[PDB]
Amino acid sequence: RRCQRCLLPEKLCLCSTITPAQAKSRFCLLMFDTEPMKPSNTGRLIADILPDTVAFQWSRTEPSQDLLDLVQNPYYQPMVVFPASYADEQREVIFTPPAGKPPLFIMLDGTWPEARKMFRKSPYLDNLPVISVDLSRLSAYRLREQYCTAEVAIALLDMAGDTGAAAGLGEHFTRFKTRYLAGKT
Amino acid sequence: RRCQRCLLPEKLCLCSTITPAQAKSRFCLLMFDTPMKPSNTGRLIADILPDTVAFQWSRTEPSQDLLDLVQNPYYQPMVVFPASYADEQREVIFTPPAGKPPLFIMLDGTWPEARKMFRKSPYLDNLPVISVDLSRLSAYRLRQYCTAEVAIALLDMAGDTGAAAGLGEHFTRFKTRYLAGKTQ
Numbered sequence A: 001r002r003c004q005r006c007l008l009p010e011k012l013c014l015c016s017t018i019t020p021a022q023a024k025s026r027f028c029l030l031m032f033d034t035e036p037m038k039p040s041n042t043g044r045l046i047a048d049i050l051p052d053t054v055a056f057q058w059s060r061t062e063p064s065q066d067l068l069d070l071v072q073n074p075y076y077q078p079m080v081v082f083p084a085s086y087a088d089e090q091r092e093v094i095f096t097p098p099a100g101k102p103p104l105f106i107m108l109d110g111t112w113p114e115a116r117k118m119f120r121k122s123p124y125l126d127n128l129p130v131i132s133v134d135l136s137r138l139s140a141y142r143l144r145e146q147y148c149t150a151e152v153a154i155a156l157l158d159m160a161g162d163t164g165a166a167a168g169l170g171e172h173f174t175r176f177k178t179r180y181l182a183g184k185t
Numbered sequence B: 001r002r003c004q005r006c007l008l009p010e011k012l013c014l015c016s017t018i019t020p021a022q023a024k025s026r027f028c029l030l031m032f033d034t035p036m037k038p039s040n041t042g043r044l045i046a047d048i049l050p051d052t053v054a055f056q057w058s059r060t061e062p063s064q065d066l067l068d069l070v071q072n073p074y075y076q077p078m079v080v081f082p083a084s085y086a087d088e089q090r091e092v093i094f095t096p097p098a099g100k101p102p103l104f105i106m107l108d109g110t111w112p113e114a115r116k117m118f119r120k121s122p123y124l125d126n127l128p129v130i131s132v133d134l135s136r137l138s139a140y141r142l143r144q145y146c147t148a149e150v151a152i153a154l155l156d157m158a159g160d161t162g163a164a165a166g167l168g169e170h171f172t173r174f175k176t177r178y179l180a181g182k183t184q
């Protein structure tokens, strides 16, 4: 009764509406559980609009070597997307994607206690900059300026100059949330 | 808090999504009254087919513009109502005839309102009643049926598949946002 690709009740299936976009930015979803994707999980909306998004199962002791190879690939400028109130005094915090190299935005995908734990117990992320997100930019896409993973990504895409992809994901996100609420009725 | 044109909350306003279509068929909305409730679906027809006409129904004095339209021999006018209500002598058809463009007269009200309109309208009595083949909704992945759903099936019955599909997609979009607005 639910479509397996978009996870909505089959009558509200939005798969035919999906139009991918292009962006200089790249996302990496670091997932706490990778359990059978819950419909309310907005992180997966990002990969619908930006199919080059990567996702990794998080692991406290044995991090995947694909993940290590990505976050260490000097082609990207990687950053950890998490609220700056969590970072320690010595941690570099930035407020803009830096200039020059394409950003790799590392999103901590889980509940808040799970994402906090991921933030504190992942040594391969510890020397990366934290990007504090400018959520006021959601207004330019007519979204309410915590915030879910797809809303942060929209702000990040806008912060990087990727306005086509930001608008694309905003429309996709709104479309999902509307149909999700409808199928709840 | 509600958009005045599409009647949904401003956050869910669909007005920018509306793409009008063209059709050989034409609709005439007969309304027991005209503020409108958001749940009324007859207004959706006009969004997709902007040549739709609507008239406020009256028992005593029908407006002359409505009398002029329904007697205009350019059209083949039809009263859209379930055939189980028609008189033994009432011409009932199951297909829009061919040749002259159809003019589909929809009785837009509640079922008690639509029935009184059907029975107490002398200017509609010589017109044929078209019984609607609702199974055609399957071709548009749809499905008492509401006004806009009956209009989709009539459009498909007439060969107006582009506008049938346009109205189906507009109808689903409104119904989804309407439901989402009831939640949250």
Ligand SMILES: C[S@@+](CC[C@H](N)C(=O)[O-])C[C@H]1O[C@@H](n2cnc3c(N)ncnc32)[C@H](O)[C@@H]1O
Binding pocket: A040, A041, A042, A043, A081, A082, A083, A084, A106, A107, A108, A109, A110, A111, A112, A115, A131, A132, A133, A146, A147, A148, A149, A150, A152
């Ligand atoms: C805790 S998860 C919540 C997941 C949500 N249930 C969903 O739809 O996927 C939200 C993640 O988005 C990012 N995020 C949320 N709010 C943020 C903020 N204010 N500043 C920086 N990143 C934020 C962080 O990566 C955070 O871990």
Ligand SMILES: C[S@@+](CC[C@H](N)C(=O)[O-])C[C@H]1O[C@@H](n2cnc3c(N)ncnc32)[C@H](O)[C@@H]1O
Binding pocket: B039, B040, B041, B042, B080, B081, B082, B083, B105, B106, B107, B108, B109, B110, B111, B114, B130, B131, B132, B144, B145, B146, B147, B148, B150
């Ligand atoms: C009773 S109104 C429903 C009003 C509803 N609140 C709305 O706005 O959609 C439905 C109208 O569509 C047409 N209709 C509905 N079901 C029909 C059927 N089975 N056969 C022929 N016409 C039908 C008739 O004109 C009827 O008056």
Ligand SMILES: [Zn+2]
Binding pocket: A003, A004, A005, A006, A007, A008, A013, A014, A015, A016
């Ligand atoms: Zn789907």
Ligand SMILES: [Zn+2]
Binding pocket: B003, B004, B005, B006, B007, B008, B013, B014, B015
């Ligand atoms: Zn509107």
